Amino acid sequence: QANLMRLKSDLFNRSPMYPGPTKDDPLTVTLGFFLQDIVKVDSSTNEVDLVYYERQRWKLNSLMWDPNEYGNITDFRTSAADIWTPDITAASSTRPVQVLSPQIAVVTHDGSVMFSPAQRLSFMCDPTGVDSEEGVTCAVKFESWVYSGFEIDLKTDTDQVDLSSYYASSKYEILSATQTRQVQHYKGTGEPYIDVNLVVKFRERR
Amino acid sequence: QANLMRLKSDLFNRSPMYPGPTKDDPLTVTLGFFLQDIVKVDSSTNEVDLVYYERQRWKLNSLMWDPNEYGNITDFRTSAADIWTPDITAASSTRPVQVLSPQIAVVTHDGSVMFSPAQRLSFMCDPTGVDSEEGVTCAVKFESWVYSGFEIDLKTDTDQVDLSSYYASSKYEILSATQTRQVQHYKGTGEPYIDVNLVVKFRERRFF
Amino acid sequence: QANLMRLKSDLFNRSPMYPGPTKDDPLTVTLGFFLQDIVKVDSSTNEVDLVYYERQRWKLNSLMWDPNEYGNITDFRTSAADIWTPDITAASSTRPVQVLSPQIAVVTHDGSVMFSPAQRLSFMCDPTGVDSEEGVTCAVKFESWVYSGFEIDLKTDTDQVDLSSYYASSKYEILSATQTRQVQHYKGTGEPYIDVNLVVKFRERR
Amino acid sequence: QANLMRLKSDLFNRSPMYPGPTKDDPLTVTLGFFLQDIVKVDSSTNEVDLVYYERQRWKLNSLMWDPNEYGNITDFRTSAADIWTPDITAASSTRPVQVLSPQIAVVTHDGSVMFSPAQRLSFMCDPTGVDSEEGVTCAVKFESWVYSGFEIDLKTDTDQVDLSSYYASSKYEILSATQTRQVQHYKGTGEPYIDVNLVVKFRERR
Amino acid sequence: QANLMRLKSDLFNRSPMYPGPTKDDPLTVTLGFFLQDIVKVDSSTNEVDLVYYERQRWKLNSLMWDPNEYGNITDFRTSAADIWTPDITAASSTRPVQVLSPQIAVVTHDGSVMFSPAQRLSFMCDPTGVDSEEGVTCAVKFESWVYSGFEIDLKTDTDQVDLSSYYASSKYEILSATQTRQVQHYKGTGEPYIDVNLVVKFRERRAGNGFF
Ligand SMILES: O=C1C[C@@H]2OCC=C3CN4CC[C@]56c7ccccc7N1[C@H]5[C@H]2[C@H]3C[C@H]46
Ligand SMILES: O=C1C[C@@H]2OCC=C3CN4CC[C@]56c7ccccc7N1[C@H]5[C@H]2[C@H]3C[C@H]46
Ligand SMILES: O=C1C[C@@H]2OCC=C3CN4CC[C@]56c7ccccc7N1[C@H]5[C@H]2[C@H]3C[C@H]46
Ligand SMILES: O=C1C[C@@H]2OCC=C3CN4CC[C@]56c7ccccc7N1[C@H]5[C@H]2[C@H]3C[C@H]46
Ligand SMILES: O=C1C[C@@H]2OCC=C3CN4CC[C@]56c7ccccc7N1[C@H]5[C@H]2[C@H]3C[C@H]46
Ligand SMILES: *[C@@H]1O[C@H](CO)[C@@H](O)[C@H](O)[C@H]1NC(C)=O
Ligand SMILES: *[C@@H]1O[C@H](CO)[C@@H](O)[C@H](O)[C@H]1NC(C)=O
Ligand SMILES: *[C@@H]1O[C@H](CO)[C@@H](O)[C@H](O)[C@H]1NC(C)=O
Ligand SMILES: *[C@@H]1O[C@H](CO)[C@@H](O)[C@H](O)[C@H]1NC(C)=O
Ligand code: NA
Ligand code: NA
Ligand code: NA
Ligand code: NA
Ligand code: NA
């Protein structure tokens, strides 16, 4: 533990936290979604509730070390409060997102950070058709709330959402789940910005 | 990262935070509303629930910098915790407002701040008749909870609430939505305060 | 801005916080209620929900200054966390009081503090009869939770609850609403204690 | 104001917080309940909700002073955050307990602390028979969550719950309410630990 | 109080907290569930709610002391904020776990830590057949959220869940409940990680054994 204590001390107390990207030094965050459950549907308010975890990855030079200097430690875990995290938000949620896992991130000696918050989200979705063979499709965009595409880029590794942890006895069966990067335009600043649109097609289990 | 670290350190550690406006140095805050959804109506309690974000803009001399001394940085993002923010509140909500976005603001080199919190609001609104062609009208005033018109002025860039992100499959269709500055006076004091009145006319969604 | 900064540092950093009143320096807090809505009634649990705001006022010598020493500043606003505030509570609430306003106070150069929290309160109230012409009466006492009448006195400017912001399209119509100082007793110390009794008579709107 | 600030500084700043009891110095905590309302009953989940305040009392040498050194102050009120408080918990609650009053304690010159939190509690209770002349009985134990009887003893000043603030128009009428110290032994350890059993027999109001 | 204050000062104020385990100093955490109640079942959303506490136990050399040097104190209690705690999470919860107990741990002189948080948990469970004789079975896996099997091992003291504080008048009777260590592997990555699988077989209560 002494070497990990040194490393954490060297990375966190010896300088300020990363202040976020800039135009001069923009940042790529990769996202993927792992969908666990569609919990419920409210046809009186057109809200659907999802449970998923969201893998976020990025890389900072300020978080690199040489494993040789610290007992060959090649990665560690630390509170998400110790580091900068991207301001990724659901654009059409109808309640504050609920946090379902520990807010802890993994940091690798090359400066890669992996943060995988599990979340319960209520979002804008009209579920009319869900009690049918064809089912229903809803979507919700994830984006940095404040950064433009000059500062933050969002990427995915695959446009296919991971269903390997989807609850087999959910009330709702998944027919398709995609995560698609998109470039939007903001009129206020004239600048592009990026979202990942999560689109889920689902039906009441037969 | 270096220059941005320096800028933030210079602005936030090398002085205390803006203490808010006074009568000798008043402040103008511009507001506008981007209405996203009428989620829910409750005809048993006369409460309606709205999702929207609120664009807030103000300018402070103490937040200005010369980009040439900071690697040509012209703006940055920072947590709303690092700066003063106006105490704007819905005057007729029935629940604590829920925050739906990161509490982060954009600060520009001229000292302009833009802060755009997304919110869910339950407020006082009689939905009797919302299942009709004419729909219903409800209104909610936004104001500083503690500052009068001698310290804080509120204004809008437009009268029209922005409906470009309004949810197309909401249970409720928006018929109109306006945001209007009003000058009020508190009880018998004759002392002025300003609000922005959010008036929304809507009906149950509907040939189709 | 700098004069206000100086004032606040002089008041808050150069002395600790007011420790609360004592038998020998008791404090008077004036309360007034501004009723906004009876939001709902639950006849199966005998709980009624009110929205109001609560004007609180008190005066401390430690918060006085001379406006001429501070660029003619006569009043300022500050976070209620920066100052002492009285522990006024509804004695028969059935849920934690929910806060509907910014927790900021107004301080005037004579040492007067005004704090006006808005609140949603569930409290004990049998609404049986609300659907008639005569209506129903319910009441709730507000008091310091830990101070006696020897440390904290409560007073009202007026017996009449202010209804100038009562919602005109409330499900419930206010027939009368008073706020009346009362003196109480308690055999655990014998000391008197003060409450403001909010008495509201209402019915379903016609 | 000044004597009180000096006293509070002497007690809280000049020394750290009481760290809790030990086998060598055990601590007796007295409890007493003041039952305000049975707010509701859920027969589909066997949960009942009570509102009450719970008087907690203990005594620490470290909180003593001589009134003559502090201008004859014989007591004061302070934030419960300033002092150690016992970790008493309802052992069969079904929801986190909701705090209904300011978390402020009374400290006396002899080192006695009195802390009286108002609370709403959902707990495990089968209300079958509540609508009958006999009514129903439910119980919940209150105990230290982490201390044995070697460190903490609990007791009551009376075995009768105080009903003098019980809500007179509650849906539920109280037939008896008792509070009784009990000595338990953990599994096969022989190690004692104490609880106060709150037993309430109630029925639907005639 | 003085001997305890010294002890706490020497353990917490002279060094930082345990930073967690690493591949070269891995940690074993022991978990035990004490099931108190199945509070409700929601057949419209396939969520069930449990009340339980969860005994967690682990041992750190950095929290050891000689009782001789501290007035024979052999253990103490302290706020869970003062120490490292393991990031154990239920993997199929559908709401944030609700905390029902004070967040305080017990630390012994050998450097053992025992933290027993009382919880209400909603989790993914299809209750279809819960009204029958044989009832229904649901499962929830508990695991470190960020550590793999190279840094954290989880085990149980025994496979039977402790039912000695299960509510005698719950709406639901427990037919069995077990807590079993499992080895998983993440995706195709080949890399192990451990869970404790909480498996509860339950039915709506009926008086008598229900099969006669
Ligand atoms: O600086 C802003 C302000 C505004 O905030 C409301 C939310 C918005 C949704 N996304 C999030 C990032 C944002 C954007 C793009 C490019 C530069 C700045 C920037 N934002 C927000 C903006 C809109 C549009 C866009
Ligand atoms: O006298 C008051 C108290 C009252 O407090 C509740 C909140 C209010 C919102 N704003 C903040 C300042 C205030 C106002 C304006 C002019 C003189 C007095 C005065 N205040 C508050 C008042 C209302 C209205 C207004
Ligand atoms: O010191 C106390 C403790 C006790 O706390 C439970 C609630 C109570 C209701 N009111 C609030 C103030 C109080 C009171 C009156 C006179 C001196 C001290 C004092 N309090 C509380 C008391 C009871 C009674 C009373
Ligand atoms: O060994 C234990 C663990 C168990 O933890 C859950 C909470 C409990 C409440 N109190 C706190 C101390 C305890 C107890 C008493 C005597 C020896 C061991 C012991 N504890 C906890 C125990 C229960 C019961 C009791
Ligand atoms: O690659 C990952 C990411 C993923 O993150 C979500 C949470 C998980 C719970 N534990 C924590 C460590 C982890 C794991 C084990 C072995 C290799 C990679 C790996 N992780 C996480 C993983 C799951 C599963 C497992
Ligand atoms: C940034 O600022 C410098 C000097 O302050 C100026 O010469 C130029 O316009 C900008 N960028 C450079 C030189 O990269
Ligand atoms: C304050 O009032 C004085 C006269 O009483 C006046 O000369 C001056 O303009 C005011 N000062 C400030 C700083 O506003
Ligand atoms: C305090 O008590 C002393 C001793 O009985 C008494 O003489 C004096 O009147 C009191 N002092 C103050 C400052 O109130
Ligand atoms: C602790 O134990 C020692 C050695 O067994 C014994 O001599 C003594 O009585 C105890 N010391 C204290 C300080 O209580
Ligand atoms: Na959002
Ligand atoms: Na989880
Ligand atoms: Na408000
Ligand atoms: Na508990
Ligand atoms: Na209260």
UniProtKB/TrEMBL annotation, chains A, C, D:
InterPro entries assigned: Neur_chan_lig-bd (IPR006202), Neur_chan_lig-bd_sf (IPR036734), Neur_channel (IPR006201)
Residues involved in Mg(2+) 4 binding: 148, 151
Residues annotated for Mg(2+) 5 binding in this entry: 151
Binding site for Mg(2+) 6: 185
Keyword Calcium belongs to the record: yes
Residues the entry annotates as binding Mg(2+) 3: 75
Binding site for Mg(2+) 2: 75, 151
Pfam families assigned: Neur_chan_LBD (PF02931)
Superkingdom of origin: Eukaryota
One MF term in the entry's GO annotations: transmembrane signaling receptor activity
Amino-acid positions noted as binding Ca(2+) in the UniProt annotation, renumbered to this chain: 164
Every Neurotransmitter-gated ion-channel ligand-binding domain range: 16-203
Glycosylation, residue list: 72
GO cellular component terms attached to this protein's record: membrane
Disulfide bond positions: 125-138
Keywords linked to the UniProt accession: Calcium, Metal-binding, Receptor, Signal
Designated name of the protein: Soluble acetylcholine receptor
Lineage start: Eukaryota, Metazoa, Spiralia, Lophotrochozoa, Mollusca
UniProtKB/TrEMBL annotation, chain E:
Neurotransmitter-gated ion-channel ligand-binding domain: residues covered: 16-203
Record keywords, A-Z: Calcium, Metal-binding, Receptor, Signal
Binding-site residues for Mg(2+) 4, renumbered to this chain: 148, 151
UniProt-annotated glycosylation sites, renumbered to this chain: 72
Pfam families: Neur_chan_LBD
GO MF annotation, one: metal ion binding
Chain sites annotated for binding Mg(2+) 5: 151
Entry keyword Zinc-finger: no
Origin: domain of life: Eukaryota
Gene Ontology CC terms: membrane
Residues bound to Ca(2+): 164
CDD domains linked: LGIC_AChBP
Ligand binding (Mg(2+) 2): 75, 151
Disulfide bonds: 125-138
Binding annotation for Mg(2+) 6: 185
Binding residues for Mg(2+) 3: 75
Protein name: Soluble acetylcholine receptor
Gene symbol of the encoding locus: LOC100533247
